[PDB]
Design a protein around this ligand. Sequence first.
Ligand SMILES: *[C@@H]1O[C@H](CO)[C@@H](O)[C@H](O)[C@H]1NC(C)=O
Lengths: 50, 46, 50, 49
Amino acid sequence: ALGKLQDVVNHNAQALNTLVKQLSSKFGAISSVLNDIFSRLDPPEAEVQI
Amino acid sequence: DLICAQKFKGLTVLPPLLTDEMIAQYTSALLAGTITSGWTFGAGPA
Amino acid sequence: LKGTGVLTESNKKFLPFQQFGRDIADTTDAVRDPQTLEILDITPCSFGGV
Amino acid sequence: ASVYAWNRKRISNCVADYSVLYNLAPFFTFKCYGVSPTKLNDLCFTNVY
Ligand SMILES: *[C@@H]1O[C@H](CO)[C@@H](O)[C@H](O)[C@H]1NC(C)=O
């Protein structure tokens, strides 16, 4: 009976989850971790990945 | 555990200003007014 | 692996082959010392809003 | 060896010191992909070929 209210709650949760899952994408870079990029590349060519 | 995982990424939740007891108090006041006064308390004195 | 945080003794049951752990967000959560083979949990130190 | 019969050597379980390589004649080419050579012998690798 109380689906509508529950829907609201569920929606918000979903959004947050999606946002977290976007932190594992590299968007065409060499890695998803900033520390690896900075510790493996010299700054003149490390700017494009960042 | 999901709340802590979200918190360690900078995402947090703020509490409402009115608590549940306060909202229940509003509802009880409205119910008492309509039971004892009809519709007179919505237009002036009860 | 370069990071910042607090290192504590964890109760994770790494099986002998597993070296480091990950969380839901797919980031390093626990590590293993390559001098004592001890499992250490990593937690960012305290922060908040003002 | 010849280029059609190039030799492959496996390097593992050691301390990789890349500092001491500028000891031959000045080499024309020293080019790295995915990593920089500017004193970046502070990384740890699984195996070397
Ligand atoms: C080799 O590493 C182990 C830990 O894995 C350490 O206990 C030992 O002392 C090391 N060997 C030497 C010769 O120090």
